[PDB]
Amino acid sequence: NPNYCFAGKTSSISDLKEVPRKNITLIRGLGHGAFGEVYEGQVSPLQVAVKTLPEVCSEQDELDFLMEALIISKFNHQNIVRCIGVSLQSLPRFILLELMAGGDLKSFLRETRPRPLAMLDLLHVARDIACGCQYLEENHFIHRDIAARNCLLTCPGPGRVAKIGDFGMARDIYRAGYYKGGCAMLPVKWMPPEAFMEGIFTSKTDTWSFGVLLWEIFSLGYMPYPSKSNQEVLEFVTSGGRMDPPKNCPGPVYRIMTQCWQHQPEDRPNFAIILERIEYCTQDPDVINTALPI
Ligand SMILES: Cc1cc(Nc2nc(Nc3ccccc3S(=O)(=O)C(C)C)c3c[nH]nc3n2)c(OC(C)C)cc1C1CCN(C)CC1
Incomplete structure (x- = not known):
């Protein structure tokens, strides 16, 4: 055992x-x-x-x-x-x-995209995952793979709750201490500079990945860094490059993403601060009255 x-x-x-x-x-x-x-x-x-x-x-x-x-x-x-x-x-x-009767978050966003969902639905998904991340942070557990594909929904309709539903990467590091895979299997597009360069992981690693998740949420399920390969992303991010706001993204939401992506881990917010910032966005009528693109 x-x-x-x-x-x-x-x-x-x-x-x-x-x-x-x-x-x-x-x-x-x-x-x-x-x-x-x-x-x-x-x-x-x-x-x-x-x-x-x-x-x-x-x-x-x-x-x-x-x-x-x-x-x-x-x-x-x-x-x-x-x-x-x-x-x-x-x-x-x-x-x-x-x-989780709503399936994964990535497929939910692509399938439920307004066609010929509102900002508050997206903010609630974000807050739910931030709550799960704060629980991991307070218990000194580093997820290492926060991403829309690893989040699930209780149901498709109103009242849905988002939850973290995969711990595969964390398990791999727990047993071996290193990553089963190799460079081609690493979730490069979700990782901060100190993680892919030094193999240094802290709860500030999860802060960065949460920023990428926020982009996946507010883009309605797009793949991060559109048209860029893993190596292009690695070079872009290490040189200070950051994603643009998703289409119609409110400014206060985009500012949370840019704070999650600060180069220095000590300059990134912890999950308690991220939660406070998401909570303030949900209170702001100018944020929640922004229409999602159709
Ligand atoms: C992806 C998914 C998940 C669930 N529900 C679920 N799935 C877990 N896991 C899981 C599942 C599949 C693959 C990998 C993992 S996984 O565990 O490896 C990780 C990638 C999440 C669940 C684990 N706990 N609860 C789960 N619920 C679902 O439930 C049905 C009952 C709605 C429907 C769908 C698809 C969505 C797209 N279309 C319609 C096809 C169906």
Whole structure:
């Protein structure tokens, strides 16, 4: 049993809630995660997302899968997907998570784009993720991969809550201390200069990635640094280059992004300050009355 440490408490495979396999039913495929397929399922009924581990995998993949279950089960915050439990004693092995019926944020933004959503919907998504990030920061947990593709929504309609739903990068660094991948797989477009240059990671790394997420949100799901490759982005950012505001982006929202992207980590705001700034934008009629492009 590899041990896992969070908020000064240690846990192991034994502390995970094993759900009897007979109580688990798969309904439909949702796509693929890092290891294998993710399904919509039911427990005992509880609506779940079922992360599966391919039966044809290395011993390292199994340990990576166990660590993912330990990481998610130990968080306790409304803006981080809950873990119902696991099914590790039957094959293929499962991790059971809170089903997010609105899907991922990137696909939600592209699909729900006003066509022939308002500024407040976008600000609420941002605040929700900032709350989850503040919980990680206060608990000294560095996410390393804050991005729209890693955020999920409880439902498509009004009342939706955005949550952080992937901890793959953090898990990779926890086990090995380094990154499974290589340069071509690193989320370059979400990383600050000290991270891709020195391999230095702090909660100020997450501040920078949150700035990029804010751009993804207010652009309604565009890929960051339009038309630029990873190496072009690396050179651009290291030289002081920053993205322009997304189309119709209110000035106070764009200023939060530019504050998240300060070159020096000490000049970036922490998540408590980011939250205060998003809260002020939601209060500003000139911000929330700005029409989103159609
Ligand atoms: C992407 C996604 C997610 C969920 N719901 C969910 N998904 C988790 N994960 C996950 C899922 C797929 C791939 C990778 C991961 S992942 O875990 O590797 C990471 C990339 C998020 C969930 C984990 N916990 N809860 C989840 N809910 C969803 O729920 C249905 C019931 C709405 C629908 C969709 C798609 C959206 C676009 N169209 C329509 C096709 C369906």
